[PDB]
Structure 1
Amino acid sequence: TTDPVRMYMREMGTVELLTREGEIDIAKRIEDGINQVQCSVAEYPEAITYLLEQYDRVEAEEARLSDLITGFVDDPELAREKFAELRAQYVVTRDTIKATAQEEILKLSEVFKQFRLVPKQFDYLVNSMRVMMDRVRTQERLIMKLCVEQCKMPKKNFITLFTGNETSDTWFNAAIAMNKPWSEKLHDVSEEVHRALQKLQQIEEETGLTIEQVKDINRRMSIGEAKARRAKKEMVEANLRLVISIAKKYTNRGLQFLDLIQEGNIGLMKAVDKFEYRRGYKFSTYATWWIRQAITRSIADQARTIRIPVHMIETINKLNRISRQMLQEMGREPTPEELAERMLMPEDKIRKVLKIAKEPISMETPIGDDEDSHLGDFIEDTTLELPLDSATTESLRAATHDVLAGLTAREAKVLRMRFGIDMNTDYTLEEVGKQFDVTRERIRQIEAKALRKLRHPSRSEVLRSFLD
């Protein structure tokens, strides 16, 4: 039936309300998902070394402690010694890679999992991983396309010596002599593949992981992220009805219905993001505060044609409240200064506050006769200049220009200099002295006679008529 109010109510009504047990199921799923990405982050060497290089900037006064960690499980001193622990576990695990390393590489994660990262920092890490994987994909697809598409080699035989290595020359230089139909064809492009192998093998130097592990790690991370969004979305879809029930309060506050329920929906999204089910707080009454917060906080900001700060809005509301009781309580209505003593502030601000609080009137408001005459049709332009005036401006130029040709060339120059007449800016009497080489008081004397010569009428009868 169109009317998007209808196509929402009917579109959301399909999602079935969650049972009290189902919420914990989804929430449990959430825990699994994030911890997967956390562990996946813990398994990246550069993610550690980066954090190290960042804390070294924190102690060097190149950053602040608030921009890196939000705190661990469970202060500048405590932060310093905890980071030392991380650094400690890092410097052992690094040298033990000579097989047996795994047992310690597993412990390096545990300490790192105690760190709660600032959301900004965490995103950059994951981004660095996905960007690094793009860097890997560039080389993966280059070495593949340079063989299969260009030199005509099947992909069926291209993956046999790839998996497990994809770095050394076992696949590139040892598989071209195999005398297969696709073997002798690999020589033409060799120069272009082997030089591009640099970045491929360099990733395992920077990141300290063979191309083998590089896919696995951020693949597990990807799964977790997907699971997370999956579960969180699922929760939100279940609770739309609550948002609908809350937004039905704020209807006429000056925002549309669907605007309300949408801003409230955003609140519910945040509510799922920050929810922890281990506290036993019902998800309904926890999200209500956030959703209710989002509605009001949104209404305050964008619902007006003239944006007003929050305290201004609340102030306005406070005034209405007093005006309500005092309307009938006083039998007339409180005087303009009556609510002023009841209110904290200087109390003469009622007039100012009461004015800016008013909503502007539609310029299309019909007034009278029902005729096409509309309020806006009666609003004159005050920034224009009447021609009866503009005419006198163009004349006054010819006037002062005429009367300035009646004087000596230096009086005309000196007066045209002291004012902006036909010249950029205007010049101070000291500047005029430097331009004329005869300086200071001397020049000023001339000015007087110039003004004096136009003062006593022959000159004066024409220029006097401009002032009314």
Structure 2
Amino acid sequence: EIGRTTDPVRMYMREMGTVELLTREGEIDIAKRIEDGINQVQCSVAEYPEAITYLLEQYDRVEAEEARLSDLITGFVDDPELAREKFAELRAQYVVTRDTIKATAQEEILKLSEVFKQFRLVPKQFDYLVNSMRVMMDRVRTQERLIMKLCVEQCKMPKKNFITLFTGNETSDTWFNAAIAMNKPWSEKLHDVSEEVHRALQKLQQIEEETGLTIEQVKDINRRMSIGEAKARRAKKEMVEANLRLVISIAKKYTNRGLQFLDLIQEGNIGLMKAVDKFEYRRGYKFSTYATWWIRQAITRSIADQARTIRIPVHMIETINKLNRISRQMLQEMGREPTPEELAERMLMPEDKIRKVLKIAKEPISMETPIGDDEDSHLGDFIEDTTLELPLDSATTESLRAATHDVLAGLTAREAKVLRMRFGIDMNTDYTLEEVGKQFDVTRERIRQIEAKALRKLRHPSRSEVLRSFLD
């Protein structure tokens, strides 16, 4: 509330306090309206042919054993036999409905929507069909808005006149002549941009041909869709908002074990939405029971990821938890301490992996903590930089470079020259033996013989003594 508050926890509780808890039958009623919405959107997809063609393409791919069976469908409302029978009769209904296009047609459409009513498909495939119908909406509205932009910005006419005249066929030359009939100045102005508008109309007709249905039915079906997902999303949001209390109660148990409570409840809300998307009452179970495991999984994932400073895999985290539980069991049984031998015995895990896991299970500590129990110095004030070359070593390197340059200057021209590129001496590049030989226009054993001659000359105790000090 407005109480000079600066804690998101407080006003999150304010937000959750507005929505009253539900009963067991209340969840069923909300899921029932959710099911009504999803049936509406399924019927909307049903009236759309192309999504069904795509679904049948994937069914054929599955029949060809190219895709997983459990990645297309999950359960039905009264197995490969049932799926085959339903998809065969569904293809029959689809083709008998499509034949009516290229009274009777309405009956075929109704039977088609009925035979989809049995289908219960994977959320991924349903989302794909929803996205396809959504991009159908997007392309239809894009064509309409292109016609809008052309007729308005090129002919200087208000947006109000277009709606009445254009709507009703929207894909013919009738409205052109109808608008021209009043001898309006914008009607005359339309004759200089008529080509582009007609080309866009041609693209709209091509889109209709691709869909296989008249554009007016496309608008009707997509508006039915849109109201469908609107109802579905409203009901799902109502469920999520009414179930926030379960998330809060579950997460507050995990708060005493580290990690921010707010992150926990946010992850639990994510899991709650996931459960809502997957919830059904045809199972007969309570929604709270189903959502509990989802919330626990989300909370465990959050503790695994966002609570460890260094990344630790979820399976590794579970192994750590099992190790800790068995350690507690052995500690309370033996009563002394967890001995590594018994830890090895309980797991299939050797023991060196056990100790390395135990090392991993600990989280990094801040340097801002004081070393020595609240000394005014911090831990990071003592950490030596190990990535910095010591000035002693830098001076040694400089002296070695000078000595090597002097020694190479003490040799002949070609020998020193070969040595410079062979090892990359005093240039920022290194070259191979054959690379140096190519520039020395001699690609044979001769270049390596020159290198060996330089080495043998350096073997003498007059050029190696200066370099002898560097390597002890």
In the alignment, the residues of structure 2 paired with residue 346 and residue 369 of structure 1 have an alpha-carbon distance, to the nearest angstrom, of 37
Which stretch of structure 1 is more off in the superposition, 141-150 or 264-273? 141-150
Corresponding position of 2:446: 442
Which stretch of structure 1 is more off in the superposition, 157-166 or 386-395? 157-166
Alpha carbons of structure 1 residues 415 and 178: separation in structure 2 relative to 1, 3 Å: closer
Q: Does 1:251 align with 2:255?
A: yes
Q: What is the Cα deviation at residue 305 of structure 1? A: 0.8
Alpha carbons of structure 1 residues 23 and 155: separation in structure 2 relative to 1, 3 Å: same
Deviation track 1:13-57 (CA, whole Å, cap 9, x = no partner) reads 111112333322212211111100000000012222333444455
Deviation track 1:215-246 (CA, whole Å, cap 9, x = no partner) reads 21111111111111111111222222222221
Corresponding position of 1:240: 244
Do the aligned residues in 2 keep the contact of 1:429 with 1:440 (CA within 8 Å)? no
Corresponding position of 1:340: 344
Do the aligned residues in 1 keep the contact of 2:422 with 2:433 (CA within 8 Å)? yes
Deviation track 1:70-126 (CA, whole Å, cap 9, x = no partner) reads 565576676555433322222222222484322122222233343434433332332
Deviation track 1:182-236 (CA, whole Å, cap 9, x = no partner) reads 7666545434433322123333222122222122111111111111111111122
Alpha carbons of structure 1 residues 147 and 416: separation in structure 2 relative to 1, 3 Å: closer
Alpha carbons of structure 1 residues 174 and 82: separation in structure 2 relative to 1, 3 Å: same
Taking the TM superposition and a 5 Å limit, the aligned residue runs for 1:29-428 are 29-56=33-60, 65=69, 68-70=72-74, 73=77, 79=83, 82-97=86-101, 99-147=103-151, 151=155, 158-179=162-183, 186-324=190-328, 326-327=330-331, 330=334, 332-368=336-372, 370=374, 372-416=376-420, 418-422=422-426
Matched position secondary structure for 1:350: helix
Matched position secondary structure for 1:70: strand
In the alignment, the residues of structure 2 paired with residue 337 and residue 355 of structure 1 have an alpha-carbon distance, to the nearest angstrom, of 17
In the alignment, the residues of structure 1 paired with residue 64 and residue 437 of structure 2 have an alpha-carbon distance, to the nearest angstrom, of 58
- Percent identity, please: 100
In the alignment, the residues of structure 2 paired with residue 92 and residue 253 of structure 1 have an alpha-carbon distance, to the nearest angstrom, of 62
Q: What is the Cα deviation at residue 373 of structure 1? A: 1.9
Alpha carbons of structure 1 residues 80 and 459: separation in structure 2 relative to 1, 3 Å: same
Deviation track 1:110-158 (CA, whole Å, cap 9, x = no partner) reads 3334343443333233223222223222333344455566545566665
Matched position secondary structure for 1:255: coil
Q: What is the Cα deviation at residue 163 of structure 1? A: 3.8
Alpha carbons of structure 1 residues 189 and 38: separation in structure 2 relative to 1, 3 Å: same
Alpha carbons of structure 1 residues 417 and 148: separation in structure 2 relative to 1, 3 Å: closer
Q: What is the Cα deviation at residue 449 of structure 1? A: 4.6
Q: What is the Cα deviation at residue 60 of structure 1? A: 6.3
Unmatched tracts of structure 2, length 5 or more: none
Alpha carbons of structure 1 residues 283 and 413: separation in structure 2 relative to 1, 3 Å: same
TM score, norm. by length of structure 1: 0.87
Q: What is the Cα deviation at residue 314 of structure 1? A: 2.9
Bigger helix share: 2
In the alignment, the residues of structure 2 paired with residue 454 and residue 89 of structure 1 have an alpha-carbon distance, to the nearest angstrom, of 92
Q: What is the Cα deviation at residue 261 of structure 1? A: 1.7
Which stretch of structure 1 is more off in the superposition, 154-163 or 450-459? 154-163
Which stretch of structure 1 is more off in the superposition, 360-369 or 327-336? 327-336
Matched position secondary structure for 2:18: coil
Q: What is the Cα deviation at residue 458 of structure 1? A: 2.8
Matched position secondary structure for 1:277: coil
Alpha carbons of structure 1 residues 17 and 451: separation in structure 2 relative to 1, 3 Å: same
Alpha carbons of structure 1 residues 206 and 460: separation in structure 2 relative to 1, 3 Å: closer
TM score, norm. by length of structure 2: 0.86
In the alignment, the residues of structure 1 paired with residue 343 and residue 212 of structure 2 have an alpha-carbon distance, to the nearest angstrom, of 72
Q: What is the Cα deviation at residue 345 of structure 1? A: 1.9
In the alignment, the residues of structure 2 paired with residue 328 and residue 66 of structure 1 have an alpha-carbon distance, to the nearest angstrom, of 46
Do the aligned residues in 1 keep the contact of 2:42 with 2:116 (CA within 8 Å)? no
Which stretch of structure 1 is more off in the superposition, 199-208 or 176-185? 176-185
Alpha carbons of structure 1 residues 337 and 82: separation in structure 2 relative to 1, 3 Å: same
Q: What is the Cα deviation at residue 413 of structure 1? A: 3.4
